[PDB]
Every structure is written in C-alpha cells, then in structure tokens.
Design a protein around this motif. Sequence first.
Motif, PDB file in Angstrom:
ATOM      1  N   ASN A   1      -6.600   3.782   2.853  1.00 58.11           N
ATOM      2  CA  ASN A   1      -6.004   4.402   1.629  1.00 58.11           C
ATOM      3  C   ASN A   1      -6.836   5.037   0.327  1.00 58.11           C
ATOM      4  O   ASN A   1      -6.398   5.877   0.240  1.00 58.11           O
TER       5      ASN A   1
ATOM      6  N   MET B   1       1.608   4.271   9.673  1.00 49.91           N
ATOM      7  CA  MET B   1       0.617   5.076   8.684  1.00 49.91           C
ATOM      8  C   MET B   1      -0.028   5.827   9.613  1.00 49.91           C
ATOM      9  O   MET B   1       0.581   6.115  10.111  1.00 49.91           O
TER      10      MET B   1
ATOM     11  N   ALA C   1      -7.196  -1.732   5.789  1.00 55.56           N
ATOM     12  CA  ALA C   1      -6.671  -0.152   5.550  1.00 55.56           C
ATOM     13  C   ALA C   1      -6.040  -0.341   4.361  1.00 55.56           C
ATOM     14  O   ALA C   1      -5.824   1.251   3.557  1.00 55.56           O
ATOM     15  N   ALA C   2      -6.293  -0.218   3.171  1.00 56.43           N
ATOM     16  CA  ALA C   2      -6.314  -0.504   2.085  1.00 56.43           C
ATOM     17  C   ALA C   2      -7.753   0.271   1.526  1.00 56.43           C
ATOM     18  O   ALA C   2      -7.822   1.646   0.328  1.00 56.43           O
TER      19      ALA C   2
ATOM     20  N   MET D   1      -5.582   6.458   9.117  1.00 59.00           N
ATOM     21  CA  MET D   1      -5.676   5.219   9.837  1.00 59.00           C
ATOM     22  C   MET D   1      -5.633   4.559  10.570  1.00 59.00           C
ATOM     23  O   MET D   1      -6.581   3.943  10.854  1.00 59.00           O
TER      24      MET D   1
ATOM     25  N   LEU E   1       0.684  -1.313   0.256  1.00 59.26           N
ATOM     26  CA  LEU E   1      -0.164   0.415  -0.060  1.00 59.26           C
ATOM     27  C   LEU E   1       0.399   0.478   0.012  1.00 59.26           C
ATOM     28  O   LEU E   1       2.271   1.476   0.266  1.00 59.26           O
ATOM     29  N   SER E   2       0.183   2.531  -0.673  1.00 57.49           N
ATOM     30  CA  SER E   2       1.146   3.372  -0.500  1.00 57.49           C
ATOM     31  C   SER E   2       1.318   4.209   0.543  1.00 57.49           C
ATOM     32  O   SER E   2       2.276   4.831   0.868  1.00 57.49           O
ATOM     33  N   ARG E   3       0.517   4.370   1.475  1.00 54.33           N
ATOM     34  CA  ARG E   3       0.563   5.234   2.051  1.00 54.33           C
ATOM     35  C   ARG E   3       1.126   4.359   3.871  1.00 54.33           C
ATOM     36  O   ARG E   3       1.549   5.318   4.435  1.00 54.33           O
ATOM     37  N   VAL E   4       1.504   3.328   3.891  1.00 54.00           N
ATOM     38  CA  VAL E   4       2.009   2.784   5.268  1.00 54.00           C
ATOM     39  C   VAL E   4       3.389   1.805   4.616  1.00 54.00           C
ATOM     40  O   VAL E   4       2.853   1.171   3.502  1.00 54.00           O
ATOM     41  N   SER E   5       4.249   1.577   5.522  1.00 58.88           N
ATOM     42  CA  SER E   5       5.553   1.431   5.176  1.00 58.88           C
ATOM     43  C   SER E   5       6.005   0.534   6.386  1.00 58.88           C
ATOM     44  O   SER E   5       5.776   1.112   7.756  1.00 58.88           O
TER      45      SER E   5
END
Lengths: 343, 342, 342, 343
Positions: D343, D294, D339-340, D298, D276-280
């Motif tokens: 996002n 996050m 979570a997706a 979120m 996912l783009s916003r969680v690393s």
Amino acid sequence: DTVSFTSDNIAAAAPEIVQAMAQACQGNAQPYGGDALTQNVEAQLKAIFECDLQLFLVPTGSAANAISLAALTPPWGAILCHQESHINNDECGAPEFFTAGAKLIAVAGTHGKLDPQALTQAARNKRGDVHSVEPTTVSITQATEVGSIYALDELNEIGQICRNEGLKLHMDGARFANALSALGCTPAEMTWKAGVDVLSFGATKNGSLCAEAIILFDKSYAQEIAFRRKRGGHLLSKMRFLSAQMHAYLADDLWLTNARHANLMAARLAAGLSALSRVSLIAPTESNIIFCRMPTKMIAALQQQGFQFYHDRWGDGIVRLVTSFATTQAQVDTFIAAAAQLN
Amino acid sequence: TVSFTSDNIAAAAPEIVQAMAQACQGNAQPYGGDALTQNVEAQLKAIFECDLQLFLVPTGSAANAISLAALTPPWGAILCHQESHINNDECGAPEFFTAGAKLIAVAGTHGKLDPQALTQAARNKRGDVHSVEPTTVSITQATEVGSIYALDELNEIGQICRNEGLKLHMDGARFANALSALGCTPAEMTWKAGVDVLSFGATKNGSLCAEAIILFDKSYAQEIAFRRKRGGHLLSKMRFLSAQMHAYLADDLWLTNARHANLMAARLAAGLSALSRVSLIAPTESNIIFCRMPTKMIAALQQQGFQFYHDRWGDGIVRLVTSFATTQAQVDTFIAAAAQLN
Amino acid sequence: TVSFTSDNIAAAAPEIVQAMAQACQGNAQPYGGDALTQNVEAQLKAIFECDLQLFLVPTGSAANAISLAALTPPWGAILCHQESHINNDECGAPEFFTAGAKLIAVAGTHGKLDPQALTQAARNKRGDVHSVEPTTVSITQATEVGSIYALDELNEIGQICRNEGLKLHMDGARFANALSALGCTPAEMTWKAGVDVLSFGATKNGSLCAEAIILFDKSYAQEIAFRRKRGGHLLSKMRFLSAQMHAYLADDLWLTNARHANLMAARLAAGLSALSRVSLIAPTESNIIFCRMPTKMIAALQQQGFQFYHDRWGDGIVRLVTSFATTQAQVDTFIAAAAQLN
Amino acid sequence: DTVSFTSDNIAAAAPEIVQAMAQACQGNAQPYGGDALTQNVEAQLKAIFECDLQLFLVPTGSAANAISLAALTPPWGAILCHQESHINNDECGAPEFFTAGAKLIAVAGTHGKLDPQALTQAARNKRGDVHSVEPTTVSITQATEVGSIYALDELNEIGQICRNEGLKLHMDGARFANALSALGCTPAEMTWKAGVDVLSFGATKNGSLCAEAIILFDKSYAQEIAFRRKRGGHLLSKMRFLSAQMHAYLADDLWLTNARHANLMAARLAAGLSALSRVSLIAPTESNIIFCRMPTKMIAALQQQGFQFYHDRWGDGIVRLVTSFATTQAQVDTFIAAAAQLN
C-alpha cells in the motif's frame, strides 16, 4: 410362418377393443386420467374385485411391476421372488431401476411357485443386520411364467407369511385372466383376500393393445404410485385411449372369454403333443403356456416348416408353446399333425 | 364446452385411429420387429434426409428422459431453461433416468436460451472434481410458451455444443408447430443445426400416444434401446404405436394439422387484440396465445363454459392453446363472447 | 477376551499411528494435492511395476462400489460369486453406486468362480434387449471362504473377460494374505492376469481406515474421480489416509503383518483339525478358516469367553479369522479349550 | 513456508486429536461402532445438545449432508436450499445421488441465508401437482458458506415455516462451532430448539481429521440413516478411530476454543486490513471467513511473495481469507505487514 406359439403378444387386439378407441376419440376430454371414461373403469374394477381400490393405467406390464415394487420397496430393501420370475429375467433390471437399486433375492421353489418354507427362511435371514439388505416385499407371478398357477390355499399361505414377517405382496398378473379362468374363483379371492396389496392387472396379452393396470388395494401407497408413474414417464395425457381399451376389455366378460379360449387351445395342444411317444410335458398345463420336451431333430424340423416358438433358453429339448385369444383349432391341430409325422 | 386449455384435450385425427384398425389384423413380431415399425423408421429417414434410429415411446416426457439419460452421465449436468418441461412438469423424470444428473437453468427470454449465458454456463467450474460437469444441453422447439427458435439461433446453440464438447437434445413436443411456421426442412431444424437426439412429438398434433425418439448420433443407439426397455417403455404390440406414426406422416397430415393449429391461433389472437380491454402480452408464433383480459371477463367467460388457464402467470393473464381440431366456429365464438363482455 | 471373529477387530499397527502424528505437522494442499499422497501413488507404481492411478477411500465396500460403478452401466450386470462380499455384506452398495446394476451369481467351488460357468453366464442372452448385459466380473482375492485364486486361475478368468469383452475387478480386502501365501509379485496377481481395477485393502492388515482403489486401466480415471466425490469418499485431509498407507507399505510392513496372520491361522487349523470331532471344510490358504464342530462345543467355547461367527453358513460351521495382532497364546488357548471339550 | 488463508481444510489436527487415536488403538474392539468409545461419544453429544439423539460418524461432511437428506427426501421430493449452498455446488451432485434423483430448488436470500418469504413461497408452490416434484425438505448452512451466521430468531422462523408446511429441516454444520462460538448460545438452541431434525455436525475444519457426525434429533429416521450410511460405504469397521477424534474434539471444550481462535484470528486479520487505505471489507466479519477488496497489483504481489488465497472467484479484486484453529498472530501480522508495504 403364420402359425406361431412364441407368445400371446404376437396376436392383434380384439375387435371390440379397437372399436372402443374409435368411439372414444370423440370430442374433448380432461387429460391425465381426469376424464369420465377413466372414472368409469375404476368404478367397474371396484365392483369386480368387491372392494375399494385405485386404478393406475400404464402402457407396459413391466412398468406395472417396476412402479408397484418401487412404491413398496426402499432402495435398501429386497424383493423376494422366484428365479424364473419375469422381474428377474426379462425386464432389463426395471425393478432395480425404479426401486433405486433394491436387490432381488431369488427364493427356491418348484414349477415357478415360491416355496413357503424357503420364503420364510429368506425373509428372516439376517433380519436386524445393518450390513444386509432388508426383505420388505414379495413378488409372485399369477399365472406363472412356466405355465403353472398358484392355488387359493397357496396364495393365502404366502399372504400369511407376508403378514407374519411384515412383508408386502405384489402379484404380477400379466396373464391374470388365464389363472382366474382355470380356477373359476372370484378376482377378490385370488388377490386382496389372499393378502395381495398391489396387482399388475394384465390385459395386453389377453386382447388389448397396451392398456395395463396397476390395481392398488392398499391406498396408503397411492401418493407413491401416482408420483412414480409420472416420474417414470407413464402418465399419458390422452388417458381415455387406454381406459377405452380396458372398458371394452371388461365389458360382457370379454376378458374372461378371451382367456378361457386361450386356455382351451393350450390344453388341446398339450393333449395332442403328449400323446406322441417322443414328446412329454414337463408338467400338466394350467394356463395358456406349455413346457414340453421334444427330440432335438423335431425342434429343428418344426421351425424349418414355418412353426415359430421359443427354444434354447431353458436347456435342450425344452420348448415353450404359448397360445392366445386368437388361436384357432386349425393352428393347433396343424402343429400337432406336423410333430406327429416327425414322431 | 369450448376449451383452449391445451392441445392434449383433443382426440386423434380420424386417419390415425383408422390406421390402427388396419394394423389390428393378423399376428406380428412384437417389440418393434414388425415391418410397420421398419417402415415408419425408413419414412422418417427420408423426411430428415439422413440416417437415424427410431424409438417409439408412449409419452413425450419419457422421450426426453430416455434421450437425456443416454447422453448425460450421473456426474453430468443438463443445461436447460428454467421454465423448460424437463425442469418443471415431469416430476424429475430426467433426474430419474439419468441416475441423478443435475439440471442447471440457463437465462433467456421467451423460453429460449441465451447464447452468452449458455457459453458461461457450459464453462463454469470446468475440471473441478467437486462440481458436476456440464455435458448436455436441452432446448424446446417450439418452446413451452409457444416461442420458436430461428434456424440461426439453433445453429449458434449447435456450434456452442461443438466448441464446448456438449450434446444437444431438442424437446419437440410441438415440433410440427414450429416447423410449419418456419417453413424449413426437418433436417435444418435438427441435425443440420447440431441436434443429436430429438423427442419427436405427435400426440398434441393428432396422435393418441405416438411419441418418437429420433437419434442422429447412432453411437448412442445401444444406450437408448436398453434404457427404453429398462424404463418400461418398450411396448410388445409396437405396431399400434407405429400405425399412429404411419398415418401421422402419410400425405403430410402432420404438416397440415400443425398449419391449421397455428392458423387458428392467429385468428383467435387477432380477433381478441382488436378489443379495447383485451391486449396481447406476446406475439403469437405457433399455437399458444398469451393475452390480458379484465378480471370480470375471465370469470364471465368461465361461467359461459369457456376453459383456459389464467392465474398461473399473473392477474388477468390468460393462455389460449389451439389444436388441430379447433374449428373456425370455435374461434369466432370465443371472440364474439369476449367482444360482448368488452 | 480371545476373539477370532474378524481381522477388523484388531488394533492399528504402531507404525501406522506413528505416521499420522508425523503428518499432523503444518499445512498441506487438500484432496490429494499434497506431496505425501503423490508419494504413496508413486510408491505403488513401483510395487506393481506399472503405471497406475491411486484413489484412497475410507472403506473397502466403497472401493468395490466405486470401482464397479465406473465399469458397469446401469443396464449392465456384474458377474460374481454367490458368497461374494458385494452380494451379501454391503447392503446393496454396488447396486447403489451402479444406479441399479444387477449382480448375477456365478457358480463356483470354494468361493472361486468356475471358468466354464463364467463364460456361459457372459454369453447368456447377449443381444437380448429384454435382459441385462453382462459387463464386468468381480473376483475376491483372497476370497471370503479363506480360499485363494492361484495364478493360473486368475489368468484364465482374465482371458475369459478379454474374450467376452468384460472388465475385471478384484476385491482385495485381504489382498496381502493371498499375496503372501503365493509369494508372487503384485503385478502377477493383478494386471498381468487381466485385472483392470483393484480394491487394495489395508485396514484388515493393520491400518485404521486407509483403503485404496488401484486403477490399472486409466481410461476410467475420470469416472472414479467423479464417483468417489459424488459418494462422499473424497476427504479434504487425505494426507492422514496416505500417512497410513505410507507406513503400511514402508519396510514391507504390510507383507509382515499378512504373513503373521496366515501363520496364526495355520497354527489354529492344525490344532483343531488334529482333534477327534473337529473337521476343516477345506485346508486353510489365508487367515480365514472354516471348520465343522459339534453343536455343544460351539456354545461351550462361546460360554468360556471365545468370540467367533456361527450359525451364518450352517450348523456346526464356524469361521475363525486371525489378525496381525493374534498371538500364539490366544491361538493355543483356543486349541486347548476345544481339546478339553472332547 | 507459505502462509495460506485459502480454507481451514489445509490445516492438520489439534495435538489432542492425534494423541487420542493412539490411546484408542491398544486392544481389540467390536467393529462398526459397537465399541464403548463410540457409545460414550454419543452419550456426550446427548448432554451437549441436552436431548436424546443418535450419532452416525462419517468421513466427510458431504456424506453427512447427502445421507441426512436422503433419509428425509423421497426420490420425487425436492430439497429447498440456497443457490450458493455446498450441497448445490461443491459435492458433485452427492445429494442427488443419495436421494435417488431428488431435485434441489434454490431459494432467494442474502449472505447464503434463506429468506422466510421466499421459502414459504417455494414450499406452497405447485402443491398437489402430480406433474411437479413436491418440496419435502429444507437445508440451511450454519454458518453459511460466506461465513455469515444465522441468528437464533432467523433459525426459529425457518423452523416454524417447516412445521407450518410439513417440511423437514436439515442443518449443514461444517463450521457449526464457528457460528456457535459467535452467537454464544447453547448447541440445543441452534439445532432442535429451532426445529432442526438432523444435523451435519462438522469437526474436520475445526481441528479433526475426518470425524464428521450425523446428529439425528428425530430418531424416526434412525433405521434409514444406518441403512443409507452402510449402503453408501460410510460405515467404517474401526470406528473407534473416528470416535477417538470426536472424543478429544469435545473434551475440555477444545472445539469451542478452536472455533473461538479461528474467529478471533479472522477479526484481527480484518481489522488490520480495513485500516489500510486501499483495501476495504465487502461484508462484516462474523466467523473465520473474510471478504475484502484489493487492487489487482497487490493481489499479484502477495501471490508472488508466497501468500495463498482465492482472488478471482467472486469479482474484481475480491479476496477471500479463511483462518483456522492453527492460525497464529504471527501469520496474521505478517500478511497485514506485507499488504501494508504494498500500500
């Protein structure tokens, strides 16, 4: 009120001991026992006990017991001692504090001396049971709190019992010189030759200010006592002021002279009191401590006249009279004459 | 042999050893029952301008451990500095008397505590059963490196202890060295700032072994009395510890000994800092100097008979501690020897 | 074999192990945050007819040590019987948790403290800083010798504790055996008599390891919560300790197990006492029996396969303990074997 | 109802674990570890670790840590460990309590591990100084509290440091199987082959209820651990129900399967989130513990949907997710899908 037989710590210090501190406070010295005066006292104690040992000067005889018993007893261990012993009654659990909670098992015995059969039974009791504390150490007071003294054959047997059962022996010698002067033996025969591994060499009650000594014979526990003395707050920086007392305490047999005089005044006091019809001795005195039975009216009248002593701790009529190195014949004979009139 | 290793190498003041000789006469009630122990306690009440209770002890580390044990539970935490004496040079004496309490280091400079870091440490994991709870704070005045808390920093640390329900203990092993430099009253440095228990030091300032536990919150009197006896720090012949404290406070001897020790350090640092190859690491506030010297100077000074500590903090770093017994000649001699080696 | 050594050799009750399987489904909040641990506490609030606080522990020795530690200062003293479990068969567990508190043995007949000997031990050397201060009393119900404190005997001890400022702890490893023999309410045996903390034992009455610390004086709740975590007695998956206690108390199963254990002991003591050479030290009150046998009879029973503890309390003295799983055939076999040896 | 990733202690036992205690119930057994099932379990661990050892089952892992450290560390000793270690934070001073006040000294290191240079520096620091506590023991956590895993080379290096400095090495293995499954080594290579003297062999988080094991490789402390387990109140009478859990825990490699599943469900959870783009991911996932960043909204939305986790204990948006043996692929896919959608 100046005539008191409560204890031997009410007395001041010897003039030779306070002068040694005044002569020691000259110049600079390496702190924490690394000075020349402390090294001389340890070397002097080696010659007195005729063996190698290590000196651990402590400010209190209770600390001398607690640090000694902690080096020998694990927290799961047990310390075999008499019910009337000092470590069991008048230290506020100082052994339990330093030993991290080791249990103190009272052993049967007469006149403040451990019975050999009761000690062997207590040592072998439940040995190998994980549910029980394990006896590891034995503590004997010399001279005892009740004014009695272990003989040489009585000390040698306790040491042998410790050898046979894998136990360590600690001698509480707050009144060590009183028992030594009454027997006339050498300090070695009364300690390590009998099996004693750690000795609480007492000097305060015999004329010092506060200089007590942990005399270690089994140097395998040296690291333990050194770490535990510092951990307990008993490692003084200006150690030379405690070793200055002990140097004068041992010089010219001043400690033997002071203890001999205290034993003489107690024998003189017990002789005058036991001659009275209504006064009796629980046992013939051997040190500077007397335990006699007086009528209850005689106790109150003597205290009303100014005489100070310890009573109402060991029953009714039981009175403890303790002399010191500074006790005069006039003080003893006045107490005898006062109790004689009440008789 | 001129030595600036520490102030525990000096002896006692002549008045201190003479007061014991006067107290060495007659019989007295033991374990503090004498009138001399009552006098020094009443004398300390008049100095601190408040009611207190005195507990004389042989060492200053015993005064710390006993005081901390009365305030800290076994599941509690003692907030202190990383380089504090209770956390380094007592062989776990606080952990021993407190039945295993945890000492938590708090960040700060010059042996002092930062109020922000103290507030963050006091509030860490509050209410969590799995973690030890902060209960007491320990500050050193003057600090182990010779630094001195200002009265305004002591008030802030005291207010934090009130806000967070903590207890404040002061390690005053060099209490007199900090009091003379501030010129404040002992009350303002202790209970007016919020100090509940004080380890009143006197050994380094001219006593043989007279240390004092000054309790301001008398609700802990029973615990201190029991723990002092349980720890083996209740001497029978108390009048010989009291005689030292009586002469220590009589005629402001402690204030004069401290002012002389702080003054002798100022001359020693000012004379050494005038040298080209000798510089001061930190400004001298009390009686402890920290300077930097050439490595050859350190070895050359130690060959001539001068004693000090060096390698314990870095290369070339030298610590110099003056006492009440350091003479003006002993200061000027070390300076002249360093000036020749410059 | 047929064994009467102790009631801890017994199995778990089938309802207890059933509850653990019913609780191993799904997730639950750890360390007592689950709904089952809260239900067991509320279920105990109704059983004891008062507000209380539950602290489930895996061992009855820990229940005693944690309870006494919360009530005793390290310089304090615990007044108990000489033959009490905390003074003999816990390897100094009270001395460990209490940071070295001194357990003082108080005189008493049949493992029960004498009221006149207890009040003297509490007043003994009070105010003496050289002596440990008596703070708490510990009584075992039911006792180790198989005796039982009556309600009037429990109330007298509670009054002595209130008179001398003492705290009362009850060792209830076999608490149910004493309750079933008296038939009174749990409240009348505990807090009404003056008990402040109770070591509620369930393992010996049919549980695997679910022991309970029942606190009536909730001012010590913080101490117990910190000390059982500090001692490693706070389980993450406590719902399996509370699953045992839930089935233990469900449908009065705990009262049924204890009543069966006491009846099997009365049957064993009746058959043996009727024999010619066998004598009972005292009439049995709980599931524990102390009897005197000839030395030859003791070894012969050991040589036939029977198991019991001997030579721990004297010559000829044999302790026989029944459990909830003891059958009448096991009892009658022991009676027939000992009868043949006459 | 709630899909939780707070820890692995929220889960229950494996079905085989609770069924084993029911079978060990029937009949009478000798208490306090005298039964045959406790002996057989100890015999299995001797074959799993390929060496002679001794077993001490305890209810909690904190008890396993504190009892082990108390047997190795004297009261004046020091325990070298990480700042974020469980013994230094989440035991309420349990090591300080069992060791009778031994000090815990933090050693610098990354990912919960100890640095070899910082460890040698802490061991050589203030040696022979009576005023300072002496370092005696080292404690490492495998796997660490942040899920990081010591490599075999890092374990052997710390062991030689302990042997070079006369130190004793204790390993906290609450998530021992999670580290053992990822490295793919033998249990002996992770423990005594690297120098570990005593091991806190953990099983509760991997599918047990309270069967925590003290595994002692240096049996010189056997008498000490047994005394300290009973003195601490951790010697259970009906121990055949703690060993019954451990018997099923070790049977048919159930513990290796449960740990592999926990590590697999964590790797699957970290792979779907990092896509996912916003969680690393903050750190690479090595065991069953994940750390990811996050956005704040979120976290609050996932909190309002029923998902449970820790979110503000380490930074801004730092979320820790912990999988267990009972984590399913449906529970992992549901959290990623929620979570997706956010996002």
